[PDB]
Amino acid sequence: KFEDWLCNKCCLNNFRKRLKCFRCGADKFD
Ligand SMILES: [Zn+2]
């Protein structure tokens, strides 16, 4: 994990700096 997270809806990875999943739009914290 090089400073990133995975969405809890589409399972897509995203930068730690990000705020919400750019694919489904939903936040990593729902
Ligand atoms: Zn997502």
From Swiss-Prot:
Name of protein: RNA-binding protein 5
Similarity-based family: Belongs to the RBM5/RBM10 family.
Disulfide linkage: none
Function: Component of the spliceosome A complex. Binds to ssRNA containing the consensus sequence 5'-AGGUAA-3'. Regulates alternative splicing of a number of mRNAs. May modulate splice site pairing after recruitment of the U1 and U2 snRNPs to the 5' and 3' splice sites of the intron. May both positively and negatively regulate apoptosis by regulating the alternative splicing of several genes involved in this process, including FAS and CASP2/caspase-2. In the case of FAS, promotes exclusion of exon 6 thereby producing a soluble form of FAS that inhibits apoptosis.
Compartments where located: Nucleus
Origin superkingdom: Eukaryota
Tissues expressing this chain: Isoform 5 is widely expressed in normal tissues and is expressed at increased levels in T-leukemic cell lines.
The protein's assembly and partners: Component of the spliceosome A complex (also known as the prespliceosome). Appears to dissociate from the spliceosome upon formation of the spliceosome B complex (also known as the precatalytic spliceosome), in which the heterotrimeric U4/U6.U5 snRNPs are bound. Interacts with U2AF2; this interaction is direct. Also interacts with ACIN1, PRPF8, SFRS3, SNRPB, SNRPN, SNRNP70 and SNRNP200; these interactions may be indirect.
Zn finger (RanBP2-type) location: 1-30
Gene designation: RBM5
Organism for this UniProt entry: Homo sapiens (Human)
Portion held of the full protein: 181 to 210 of 815
